[PDB]
Each structure stands twice: as C-alpha cells, then as structure tokens.
Amino acid sequence: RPVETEIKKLDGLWAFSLDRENCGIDQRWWESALQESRAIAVPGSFNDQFADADIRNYAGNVWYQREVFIPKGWAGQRIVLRFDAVTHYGKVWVNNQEVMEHQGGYTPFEADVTPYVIAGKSVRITVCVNNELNWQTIPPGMVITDENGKKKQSYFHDFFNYAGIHRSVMLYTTPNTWVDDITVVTHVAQHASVDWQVVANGDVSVELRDADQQVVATGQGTSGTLQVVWQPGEGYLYELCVTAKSQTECDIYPLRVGIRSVAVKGEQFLINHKPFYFTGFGRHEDADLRGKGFDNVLMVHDHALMDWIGANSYRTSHYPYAEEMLDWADEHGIVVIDETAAVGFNLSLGIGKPKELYSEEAVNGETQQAHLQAIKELIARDKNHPSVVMWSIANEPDTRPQGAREYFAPLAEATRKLDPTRPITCVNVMFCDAHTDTISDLFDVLCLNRYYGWYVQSGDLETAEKVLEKELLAWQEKLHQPIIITEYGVDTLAGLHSMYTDMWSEEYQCAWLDMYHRVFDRVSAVVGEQVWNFADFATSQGILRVGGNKKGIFTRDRKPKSAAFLLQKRWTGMNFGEKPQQG
Amino acid sequence: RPVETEIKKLDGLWAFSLDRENCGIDQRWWESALQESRAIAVPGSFNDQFADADIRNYAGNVWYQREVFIPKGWAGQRIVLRFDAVTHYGKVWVNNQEVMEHQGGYTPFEADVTPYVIAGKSVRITVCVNNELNWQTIPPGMVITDENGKKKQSYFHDFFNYAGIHRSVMLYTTPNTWVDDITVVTHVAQHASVDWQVVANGDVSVELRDADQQVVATGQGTSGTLQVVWQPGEGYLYELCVTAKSQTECDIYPLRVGIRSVAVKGEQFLINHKPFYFTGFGRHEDADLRGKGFDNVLMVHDHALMDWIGANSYRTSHYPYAEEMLDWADEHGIVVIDETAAVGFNLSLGIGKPKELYSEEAVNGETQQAHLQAIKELIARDKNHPSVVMWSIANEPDTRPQGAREYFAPLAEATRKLDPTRPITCVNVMFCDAHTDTISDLFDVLCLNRYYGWYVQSGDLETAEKVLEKELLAWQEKLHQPIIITEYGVDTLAGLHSMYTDMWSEEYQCAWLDMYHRVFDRVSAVVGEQVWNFADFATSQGILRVGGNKKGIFTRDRKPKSAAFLLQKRWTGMNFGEKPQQG
Ligand SMILES: CCCCCCCCC[C@@H]1NC[C@@H](O)[C@H](O)[C@H]1C(=O)O
C-alpha cells in the first residue's frame, strides 16, 4: 500500500460505456474516446448508480475511461498505476498501449507505466471491466445464453453480484530504488518481531519508534530484529521505518506493526496468551446507492455503531474488505477474521445444474488453482496487519459429495505453509453437521453457521434450543476444538410487530437471539459469537428475499431494530474479552 | 339495561340512505321504503363503512330502515323499542307513526310502542340520524355553509366525528308491572348496601345471593337493606334479585352489585379504605372499518392486551363507553373513570371563530343546561356499576376567559347532589397550569394532562423533566389534592427507528414515558398514571395528525410499539395497587 516522502486518480467522474454487442476489444475502443458515454462515479458499483433496471443486471463488458495529467515533478522516477480493486476482471490501457490485466476483483493490481507515460502531458486511461463468473472464478458461477444473445448470470452465493471499480485508483511514484516486498512477524512470551525486506539495488536499514519518532529499537539487516521489553482494547502499534539505500537515491517506507502472537490451545483462542471471546458482526461491503463502492463516511459511521453496540470483533465476510477497514481495524484494535471470496461451492442451497460438485465440469483443476491464487493474494496483501488474527480459506462449502476432502486438503497445506503465524479456519454450512462434515479437522478453529428455529424447526424455540445444544456439545466432544459461531441470525422486517412473537417480527429476532445466547453460555468450547449480518444488504432476486437479506440488526440506511439494544446490553454488560461463567 | 325471565333487532343489515337535498322529513320518507337505499351494518359508524370519501365526511341527515317481526308470544305485554345508542341525534318511527327522538348520542333512549305494534305481523322501523354539532350539543361545534349548499362541520375535539347507530338496538318485553328505576348504594367500614325501587302497581321484595342462588341476606322494602359480614383484583359481586308483585303478573329483575365505597382522604384515593395507584390507558371507542361501532371480539382482545400489559384501570375517555365495557369492567374488577361527552370547550387548541368562550353566542344557556343533561343521563345509566369509582364532568376545558367558574360551579353542585357516593373530577387542559387554573378546587380529584417535551420543550428531556417536576409539586403544595395524570403520551410511528432517540421514533416514546415515570415516582400526590391512548385512533384532518393520532402504545390493528413491553415491565413489576416508594 502506497505512502510517500501521489495524484489519486480516482477523483471525480469517469466516462462509462456498455458493450452489449461485444465490439470493444475487437474495434479497439481504448484507442479512442468512448462513443456514447455517460458519467460514472468511482469508487462505486455501476449497477445501482443509474436507477436503470437494464444496467443493474447487465452481464458482459463495461468500459471506463479518464484522461489525467501526470505531474511534472515525477521526471526521472518510475510512474506506477495502481487499481486498488476492479471487481472480477479488468484490462487497463494507457494511451494506445496495453499495460495490465487481472481476474482478482477484491484485491489490488498495479503496473509500471514509466515508458508509456511522459510526465507533463495528459494521457488517457481505459479500463475494461468484466462481471462474469464461470466455475474457475472466485466466487464461482455460470452464465447462460439464448436467442437474441441476452446473457443471464447465475451464481450460488446470496449477496448480489455488484461489479465495477469499487475502491480508489492510485498513481504513485517511488524512486528507482523501491521496497517492493516487506514482511514482519511479532512474538510475545508470558518479546520482539523479525523483519524482512525485498528491494532492487538498495540496502536495508530498519528502525522503529512508538508515539512519535521515539525509536525504542533498531536493526540493520533482513532478519532477526529483536529488542526491548497491541491489545484489543486500544491497539498500541509501533512505526517501523524501512530504508533502502542506493548510490544516488534513497527510499523510506513506514509500516505500522503491533506486537501480537495468536495461537490456539485446546479449545481457547489466545491473543497475547489470554483466552478471548468474540463478539460482533459478520458484515458486508454493501450500501445504499453505491453498491460495494468504498466511502469514508460509511466506515466512520459503521464503526461508531459497532463501538456503541459493544462489538469487539468482526469478520470480513465472504470477500476481502477494503484495506482502509483493516488500517482502522488495527488502529482501534478490533479483531478481524479475514476471508477470501471462496463462497458458493455448494449446490444444496436451493430456493424452495451439474450432477456432482467435485466433477471435472465443476470445481476441478483451474478452480482449485485459482482458489489457491485468491489465498496467495489475500495473504500477500493482509499479512502484516496485527488486527488480522485468523485466516479463512472458504465459506459454506458443500463437503458431502465425493472428492471434497481431496479438494480442501492441499489448500489448507499450502496456506499453512504461507502464513504459519496465524490460525486457519473454514466456515462450514449448516447441512453438514458433526456426523457428516469431513473437513473441520484440517483447520485450527472450527467456524459454525447455525439457523435452528428459522430454516429447520421454523418458529419453534423449545426444540431448536435442544437441537442447537445437542449439535454444539456433540461438536465439542467430537473435535475438542474452539468453535466460533460466525453466522446466527433471522430475518426481520424493520417495522413489523407481533404480540405472538412469531417469525419476521422484531420480537422473534430478540427472543431468537436470546435462546442462542443461553445455549452459547452453557457450552465451554464456544469461543465467540457473531450475529449474522450487521445491516440488511442486497441479494439476487428470490422468493426468500424481501428486497434483499433482512437478517440485519440494523437496516440498510443504518437504523436499529429492536435487537440492537438487546445486543448492546449483552455485549457491554459483560467484561471485555471475557465469556460469561455459564450466565 | 334489559334482561328477561327479547328479539335483538340489531341483527343483520339495515337500509341506509342519504338526505343531501334535505327532503326526508318534508316528503315523509319514513312512511315508505327508502328510495335508492344500500345495505348498512349495525352496530357501526356509517362513515368508514363504504370506502366512499363523500359518505365519510357527509354532514346532514341519514336514514336507517328495517322491517321486523314482532313475536306472537308477546300478546298482552308492553312492547318497548330500545336504541342503546344513536350518535348525536335520532328520530324513530314505527310503521307510519312517530314514536321517539333523542339528542343524546352516547346514551340509550327507549320508547313504549305497545299500541303502534301488533305482535305477529311485520312492522317497519325508520330512524333519522343527525350528525350535526352546534354550541348546544355535547360535544360542541359549528357548521358552515356556502354556495351549492355544501355543509362542512368543524368541531374542537381531536377524535374524528363518527356518527350513526353505534350500539345494539333492542326490542324487549316486560309484564305490565315493570321495574323502571333501581338504585343501590354500598358501604364498608374498616357493612351493607341500601336498596331502592320505583314501580307501577307492584310491591318490592328484594333478595340477594352470591355464587349461585345462595342468598346471604334479604329485605322487603324500598330502603334500609343491611345484613351479613368487590376488589380490584378479582371483583366479587353479589346478585340482587328485585321482585315487583301485582295481582296477576309478577316481575323479577337481577342486578349485580359489588360492595365498595370510594372516598378521597387528603391526597389518597380510597377504594374500600385502602390507598390505590392508577395504572392503565385512556382509550377510545375506535376501530378499523367500523368506526365507533361496538363489537365483542374487540372488547375481548383489548381486555386481553390490558390484562397482559399490567393495566389495572382506565378511563372511558371523552364519552360514555358501551355499557358492555362496564359490565366486563365490574366482572374482572377494573377501575373505571366514567366521563361525559363534554369536550372541546376551548378555543386555544389551534393547529399551527367567536371572540370569548363564555359569551352568549358560544357556551351560555342551553349549553350549560344540555351539559347538565349529559351529566344526568350518564349518571342515570352508570350509577349502579361498582367498577365506576369516579365521575368526570368535562375534559380539557378552557378555564382562562371570564365566566368559566360561573359556568362550572353549578354543574359540580348538581352533579354532587345527584351521586354523593363517588368522587368527582374535571380533567383540565395543559395551557391552564396551577397558577392560572380556577376550577380545580370544585372537584375531589384533580386530573392532569401534561405533554412536556412534546408540544413545549419539544424533544428536550433535560428541561421537560424540570418543568414537569416543578409544575407537579407546585400543584401538590397548591391544592393538596390527589392528582391523577390522565393523559401523558407522545406520537410515534410504528416502524420508525432512530439512533438519536429523537421525536416520532419508538426510542423517544420509551425514553419519554420513562422520565415522566421517575418524576411521577418522586411526587407523593400522584395517585396514578394513565398513558394517553391505548391504540392509535382516527381524528379529523390536520397537519399535526399523520393519519390520525399516533400517541398509542399499540397501533390501530392492535400491534405493539416498543413502549408496550416497557410498560408491561413497569406495571407488572410493581405490586398491584401500590405505588413505588420513590423508586
Ligand atoms: C439444514 C440446512 C437448511 C438450509 C440452511 C441454509 C443456510 C444458508 C446460510 C447462508 N450463508 C450465506 C449467507 O450470505 C446467507 O445470508 C445465509 C442465508 O441463509 O441467508
């Protein structure tokens, strides 16, 4: 992530165009200004932006374009173009010359444009964004076509498939000796932090401070770095200046790092050798009007709501969040379970198609590879953050058909070898209980999604309590692992009230979140709770979604339901980081 | 009220017609079947019944009509036609002969039709209902006209002016020796119950039982009746059979009566020599679709809600309720403050006209007389009910202009002389505080309506608490009287939520009902609380009414807001009939 000692190109509006006939790449639309274009805002999903029904569901090729002035002060320095996130696929051109491409979507991609750019004159930038999903994209999907060439995309996750440019686009400048790769690992017993470095024609000189420039250690090398002697309450974080020296130019890069070591012991999650208890939300990158587009106002407000309601942790649910969320996350010291876009590997979640989930035509080969790629990138971007205490390879995969274990074992192995300093998990779906799941052993923490009283035993608390209890303590006796409930919630209309406290009413969300909390309290292995969704969010059209997913404690415009004050009483009434002693 | 030892004529549908040109009484519409009629349901207000905007606000003359068969078994007995309630004015005809008329509205009126009726053949019944209000109606109003003769009624109360036939119509039969008048007064020290009687050519023999026909006393005469030796929890009530004997026929009439004596001592309301604390609602005779029409299902459900929420008392707000509510009220033993339709005697409640409220053109002469009449009738119908512990002459009158005291003193005197066994009150408006009110001395209990934090000091709890406190203890030091707060509430949209707990949100209704309850708890003279309205109800069109009055704890279809559970926690958490010891 860039700092300096740049011109943020995401300012203002871009030219936006559709490619229904799919003429763009053939007719070389990037070598000219978009014919019949309209203004679009970055960052922001293109679907909700124009109130156009046909634009919202369009599946194909979209074209962004924007001219920019390259500042004169960057004469002999390398000019680099960074896209913090272009959702699903993007191919970037700089003034008649093709520079870059990436099929990531929720992770950045950058390219060196020093030759193709002459600092001082205006150059045009054309981005081709694709929002298609097949079986080798993360998350997976499948497109269908018919007569008239109308393309219709179908996917297997819940949230709506927003696309476009979702995070800032940067255009940064570094001297010809840059610090391309950095790694830092911290230890603590009852300690210090090894440092790393990768550069070109430059030596490494590492120093680190605390409050302000008050160095309290130092080191000269690409290893070791140990010296003098970060909490979930405040979050004390030192500033690690890295220096790369050359004959002519010098480079200085500041990296905030917090001393912490996370490890699992029996059925306890230890951050700095202390048992913890997770409370908070599994949220989404969703908002009114802008899709998954990032915005600072929303981050400030949502963090205010989480601070008020007593949440101490949350999970970047179902895709990598914007890194600003993680910088804030280690600033205010909130625990984060980071997760990849690996979601939807299941054909059993049917609103009420290949024949076997781990066949060749679906999830085999490039699917496993590209999943390992999403791992490699998520870790290569979020490795240094002290707020990240957990890895999460995938979310709710069907592990019942033949070949699921053969799929998930190598990913666990490679991911563990990539970052051994943090525990790893895989959130499993509800249809795979303790007697049918075959993957929960590969991972350090078991994550659970449970909806007893909603999908099954619908509306019956008296029996859903028993089934949840039996399933829970049966998990505990089965694997003797720390179990975090990462999804538990029920849909609720914001204004619907009912004397009988039946489903969809706020009284049922309150009484349903309560029983789950008692069963949570009488189980020793439950190392945390995360009510399903923070706020109501947009999903695809189905007969089970009443204008999106209504399982939020807050509405979409961030207004509280009756459960927000219940949870604010529960989480702030207990001691921070502690679980109730069975009551 | 009739029993026997009848044919309820309110069964099914009646013919309904409008009189826009005002031709009815002139062209003798009762002597024929209504030309161009449509089916209407009794009981039920005619305004909401047809979804017709023009029918709902129509101000003039409406015509009901229904043929009926007079049963053969009533050959030589007197046949009487009873209208339990015809709202505002009614003139009743029986088969080409005019029998009765009444300008009451919320009280019954009956007439002897033995000559005009021959039991065995069908007779027609035509009712002329008027919904107009001038300065001599209770409640008062004033009608305006223009070109095209369009009449437009304006009144000064809040609730909508529903009209029509609102309660059952009876057609009962009694032997030629009937018991026209009965009175019963009960005493209790640390006792018995004098009896009364009025008949024609019949002697009085009085006996009374308990559970079933188990007489535990007796008496032969029209006085005395004292013998052996009713609570707000259950409500034990004896059965008093009255007998009127003649040479040929005999009459037996059962009257339930509960032993109780209510009296005010200093600043305490004593029912059976015990200090009390009022909790509950000031409700309305309003419902979806039927206007003010009575219905048993609604009474059962609303009594279920009041029983659940912990209410022990309520006030028949702004008009005499249906007597079934009072029979239920003494059955389950709920305390009732009975009130007349005397409401709207104020020109200061302006949404933001004569010149002085007690002039001759407005409130003078027949206005005072007819008010005394509404008194006389309310007392003549609800005198024997043990559930009625209080008289309430009027509600929110402007007592600031010259001549208010000269108006209200004689009504208090005559009303006290009519029923001295129960305390009397007058609910005063907010604009007349302790330093400006001039009538609160005439009455036994002072009733208060207060809206600090809503109309004045809007949205500010920190100062509305001080103003409410100062006003309250200043009342206490001023008159040293028992003060019941009979109206305190704020409007609330059923589904509107807000993190800032500002006005119209459920959080503001909760936090606003709470502060009022603390200030209630630190005042010794407050002998009860009644949150303003039980359920949202229909009012006239104004810029302050969002589809009616939203100051209800429940919605109109009887669905709870966030305050219903708060009040259910407060009222059932305290001991029944007791006020918290300042906390
Ligand atoms: C026995 C299993 C019956 C069906 C259970 C389905 C659970 C699927 C959980 C789903 N997991 C994905 C999440 O985004 C969705 O919000 C959540 C949902 O349902 O809305």
Ligand SMILES: CCCCCCCCC[C@@H]1NC[C@@H](O)[C@H](O)[C@H]1C(=O)O
């Ligand atoms: C200082 C006085 C400022 C204005 C206060 C007005 C209080 C009127 C109280 C009114 N009393 C009558 C009742 O039916 C209505 O529901 C209630 C209301 O407001 O809605």
